[PDB]
Design an enzyme around this catalytic site. Structure first.
Site, short mmCIF file in Angstrom:
data_model
loop_
_atom_site.label_atom_id
_atom_site.label_comp_id
_atom_site.label_asym_id
_atom_site.label_seq_id
_atom_site.Cartn_x
_atom_site.Cartn_y
_atom_site.Cartn_z
N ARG B 54 -28.31 16.85 24.56
CA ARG B 54 -29.34 17.96 24.16
C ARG B 54 -30.65 17.42 24.71
NH1 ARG B 54 -25.73 15.08 20.25
NH2 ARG B 54 -26.06 13.79 22.48
N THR B 55 -30.83 16.81 25.31
CA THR B 55 -32.53 17.24 26.21
C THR B 55 -32.38 18.67 27.19
OG1 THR B 55 -33.18 15.29 25.68
CG2 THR B 55 -33.84 16.42 27.68
N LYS B 84 -24.47 9.10 49.10
CA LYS B 84 -24.93 9.44 50.16
C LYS B 84 -26.62 7.62 51.03
CE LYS B 84 -23.59 13.24 51.84
NZ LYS B 84 -23.87 14.39 53.04
N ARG B 105 -34.27 13.35 34.58
CA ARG B 105 -34.32 12.41 33.82
C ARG B 105 -33.53 11.50 34.53
NH1 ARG B 105 -30.60 12.06 28.03
NH2 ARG B 105 -33.70 12.73 27.53
N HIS B 134 -40.42 9.26 27.19
CA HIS B 134 -39.61 10.67 26.11
C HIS B 134 -40.73 12.22 26.44
CE1 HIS B 134 -36.35 13.80 26.08
NE2 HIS B 134 -35.51 12.74 25.42
O1 LIG Z 1 -31.65 8.99 21.32
C1 LIG Z 1 -30.96 8.07 21.97
O2 LIG Z 1 -29.67 7.55 21.62
C2 LIG Z 1 -31.16 8.44 23.69
C3 LIG Z 1 -32.14 9.94 23.40
N1 LIG Z 1 -31.33 10.90 23.17
C4 LIG Z 1 -31.83 12.08 23.23
O3 LIG Z 1 -32.88 12.49 24.25
C5 LIG Z 1 -30.84 13.22 23.64
P1 LIG Z 1 -29.66 13.35 24.29
O4 LIG Z 1 -29.32 12.01 24.90
O5 LIG Z 1 -28.85 13.80 24.46
O6 LIG Z 1 -30.86 14.21 25.85
C6 LIG Z 1 -32.78 9.54 24.48
O7 LIG Z 1 -33.08 7.99 25.28
O8 LIG Z 1 -32.75 10.39 25.61
#
Ligand SMILES: O=C(O)C[C@H](NC(=O)CP(=O)(O)O)C(=O)O
Ligand SMILES: O=C(O)C[C@H](NC(=O)CP(=O)(O)O)C(=O)O
Ligand SMILES: O=C(O)C[C@H](NC(=O)CP(=O)(O)O)C(=O)O
Ligand SMILES: [Zn+2]
Ligand SMILES: [Zn+2]
Lengths: 153, 310, 153, 310, 310
Positions: B54-55, B84, B105, B134
């Site tokens: 999603r992110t 590397k 991320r 986040h």
């Molecule tokens: O909701 C979760 O279990 C994890 C949470 N999820 C999300 O932000 C959605 P995604 O991982 O698809 O970007 C996170 O900490 O990044």
């Protein structure tokens, strides 16, 4: 000057005198601050009878002032400790170490997953007082611990 | 120049209320009137050293909706950092000489903050730094909560599940605590409770919060039921007993739920919410994700565009 | 026992006094031999004026008596040291360190594969006077090490 | 009670020339006149926490030839020390209440010495302790050298290969150094050179030793060419260039070799000795391994039996 | 024929107080006056499909001490049951046509029992079957307890640690329950509490038992402090929170302990008994293990020898 009046530790010419160090803490400061890595004269008294506390550690270093040697840090290990600047055998300056807003380099973040470990950066923790248990917030991982978990890493 | 121009979006803790509101007001404007070429000649790095659906997709889609280009990787196995052995510092030192912004991320906490010290005037947006923060996810949650509750103050918010490793609740709680009169109901197993630093902060602000062993308890007072997944990839060996969902939400548990109440959830779900809830009017996690496009478009716009959106 | 001198040390009865400790060594003996993990009064002077040595460290420990095997351990780091036993201000005994055959439960074997680590046993090394340094042979792995490399703890 | 009765056999460094000769004198006696019931009611532990073919089988065979029973393990993977996390001190503490003696081989150096600290009056025999010592192997080697050379003094012994991690050469050099007039020729890579504590020991006794870059150099002076395998399982990452055999003996390299010369080799070989050498009169590594039975029978006999073998 | 002649030793639940005392009686006689040839022409199978150090070595040692031979395996990876997919029934159908007795330890509960249904009059001796029973471990324990306390009745016995999976405490509890006026103190984590069947059994006999959250509480009344290790290899994913020892005994905790008290522990320990305890007069787990020899010899003698030992 300052002669002996039932107090077997009172003599030095210009330097720093760290008083009221809690027992078993005088040797720590000597270590962390690398205080002995010097050619200057140092006098150290451990387990000294303290009508003040009960049993105290005492340190005296000639021609050496701890202002950039972080009284800041000292505020953590020896909160009750007192620092006197000496000159002409007399106490020209006296002060209590005050808790810093932060501490950099010296400490190590307990968080094993913190990005700080594998990278080219210096540590840093924001200091905050709670209740006889100072809390430290890592600059990077933002996680917080007690000075007893960080200092006694 | 707006307050967020060329600023790093690392932690909600560093953002004010005016900043959060600034973002939401912008998202609404862009949602109402799109601006396809706002970031026409910008190239943004999408660096995911950790998994994500999603992110990364919403962020990358947001960028395109604004006319910017995207480069990057969604797996640090193809980069020179893994194949590397390279420090995050060196990786950012080079990428920051290529792009106009960096969305990242990372598996370790502090990564985004570390990154800012190595990207001379190239904005760093934290898309999640291992269990810590986040920020954007919170902007999206704020937007959604506002959209369905009509406000961001005086709300009864319950967060269930892994709250210790939930980087989403850490940010969300800090953000909602920046508004007036919000009450928190924390429902999570002991081993995965809400970190002391969030609680102490709530106290310092006089915010009301309480713990509970079930959802039923708070089900009739909550405006928002924020479910979460157990961060299995961040749990320690001595916590594997919690890997399974201790709290399960079913369509029936909502019989005495307020009319307005909405169920939210950063979507990766693993049975914490039974699919039968999907049909109820309370389910709102898929529409929540959708709001990611608007919150993130606004963020990018404010960070990479000096003049406020009309 | 001193009065007609220029020294600034005085008043101690019944204890031990380690003298003529080469500069930058007093602190090592202190940490390396856990000499400050006690409730007894300790008096240390680092970089004290020395007639012949030029400079010297000085450790005094009340109500404590190092045995012959302990005083000899000092020979690994302060061969020139001199030890005086005290009581009722009387310096009854005086002695010198002599290089020992072994030194137990003090240092840690540098060998990462030495069995002594994750096991219920205390370290031990054979001491061998070499040229420019002292060789220490682990009683377990039998590897020899330079006393300038073997750590404490 | 003979000198070695109930004594631990840990390191050659701790045994005298008398002790060695005694073992060799006994090994010869028993070889000439077997005694199938010498250790009749004994139970011995054969504990190998590391691989072995020759040492363990020859040791256990020797035990049987004397009438003793054997219990043990040839892999610390089935023991509770591995499958349940257990210290060696605890392992020795319990095994020493079952048996009359313990034969042990362990991956970490010092293992055998440590064992002696936890086995009250039950003898411990070092079957090899991770690159440090290998006492029995030496006894076997001395027996072999005396058999083929007529003596153990005034010999020209060359040792080729991994001398740093070769526990066999550490023990053998120290023992030969307990005899008069021996001269050593060490042929090994720089990264795997003979330990300094070994060289210093030789200098202290006025023993002559010298290094060489090849076997051809010394081939015509040596009485014993002691080949060794590269101890790969003990090398450090920065030494893997040595994993391969840098010196390879071939049948042809024995052309200007003394008539009496013998090629010895503890037995696991990986190309250091060409198989075309096996057929020459100089190949003596198998009959060497064969002597392991008589050296070990004698050792067990002297340690467990008070009265010297007739 | 004594009462245990040719009998299977599967569970303490099938033995009488008579049988236990019989074994102890024999164990004392063999200890004082060994009988090196009692099982002269017997071949016993030592079959361990699961890890073991103490049980397999003392059993095998005991067999040699009585003059019997041993065959078997200590790992079911070399057997055709693992490397060729084979049922335990078949493995027993054949092995029972080779030997005179079968000593076995298996990862599944009931293995020993199952075995008896496939070993035509070849007695099976349970050396541990999963987290169920460990009969001979108990015999060793009763021997040790009677040795140090002078009796097996009217004792205060504490059992600490994993009691849910400790096959040792199950057997020991059921066995001590066969004697008069014994009192139990169970100190275990909720997740690993003594099974309900043991408790209902103690109730049915009027046996007194209490649960406690610390060792300090009971440290003044106990005669026997029986420590156990967390059976990590048997825990369920949801119990990994307990894998670490929750109760650690140190030498300082024994200041108010009865003079006669003895600390016991089957043995693979892992940080639940500080090694500083080993030096105290109360530590008795290694001696406890020493008695494994007498207990097992007696058991083998009574099962395979018709006439009682003189
Ligand atoms: O909701 C979760 O279990 C994890 C949470 N999820 C999300 O932000 C959605 P995604 O991982 O698809 O970007 C996170 O900490 O990044
Ligand atoms: O393995 C070698 O290279 C030499 C030597 N070899 C032996 O002892 C023969 P094995 O390993 O079969 O017992 C050793 O150190 O273990
Ligand atoms: O291993 C334990 O914790 C207890 C008990 N231990 C033993 O019998 C000793 P071993 O596993 O070495 O034979 C068991 O159930 O197997
Ligand atoms: Zn950190
Ligand atoms: Zn060592």
């Amino acid at each position: 000057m300052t002669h002996d009046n039932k107090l077997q530790v009172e003599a030095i010419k210009r330097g720093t005198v760290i008083d009221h160090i809690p027992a078993q803490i005088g040797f720590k400061l000597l270590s962390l601050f690398k205080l002995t890595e010097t050619d200057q004269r140092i006098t150290i008294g451990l387990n000294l009878p303290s009508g003040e506390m009960g049993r105290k550690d005492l340190i005296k270093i000639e021609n050496t002032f701890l202002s950039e040697d972080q009284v800041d840090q000292l505020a953590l290990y020896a909160p009750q400790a007192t620092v006197n600047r000496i000159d002409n055998y007399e106490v020209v300056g006296k002060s209590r170490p005050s808790l810093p807003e932060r501490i950099d380099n010296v400490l190590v973040c307990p968080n094993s997953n913190c990005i700080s470990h594998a990278e080219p950066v210096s540590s840093s923790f924001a200091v905050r007082k709670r209740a006889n248990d100072i809390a430290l917030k890592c600059k990077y991982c933002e996680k917080e611990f007690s000075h007893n978990v960080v200092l006694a890493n | 120049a707006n307050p967020l121009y060329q600023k790093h979006i690392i932690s909600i803790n560093d953002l004010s209320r005016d900043d959060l509101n600034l973002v939401l007001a912008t998202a609404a404007k862009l949602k109402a009137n799109p601006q396809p070429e706002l970031l026409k000649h910008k190239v943004i790095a999408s660096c995911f050293f950790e998994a994500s659906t999603r992110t990364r997709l919403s962020f990358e889609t947001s960028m395109h909706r604004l006319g910017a280009s995207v480069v990057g990787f969604s797996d640090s196995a193809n980069t020179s950092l893994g194949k590397k052995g390279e420090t995050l510092a060196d990786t950012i030192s080079v990428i920051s000489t290529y792009v106009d912004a960096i969305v990242m991320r990372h598996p370790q906490e502090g990564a985004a903050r570390l990154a800012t010290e190595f990207s001379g005037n190239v904005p760093v947006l934290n898309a999640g730094d291992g269990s810590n923060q986040h920020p954007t996810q919170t902007l999206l949650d704020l937007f959604t909560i506002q959209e369905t509750q009509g406000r961001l103050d005086n709300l009864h918010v319950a967060m269930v599940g892994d709250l210790k490793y939930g980087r989403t609740v850490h940010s969300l709680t800090q953000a909602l605590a920046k508004f007036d009169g919000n009450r928190f109901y924390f429902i999570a197993p002991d081993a995965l409770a809400m970190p002391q630093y969030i609680l102490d902060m709530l106290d310092e602000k006089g915010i009301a919060w309480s713990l509970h062993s079930s959802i039923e308890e708070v089900m009739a007072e909550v405006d928002i039921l924020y479910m979460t997944r157990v961060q299995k990839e961040r749990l320690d060996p001595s916590e594997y007993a919690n890997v399974k969902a201790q709290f399960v939400l079913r369509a029936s548990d909502l019989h005495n739920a307020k009319a307005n109440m909405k169920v939210l959830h950063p979507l990766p779900r693993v049975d914490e919410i039974a699919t039968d809830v999907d049909k109820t009017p309370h389910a709102w996690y898929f529409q929540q994700a959708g709001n990611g496009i608007f919150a993130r478009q606004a963020l990018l716009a404010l960070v990479l565009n000096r003049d406020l959106v009309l």
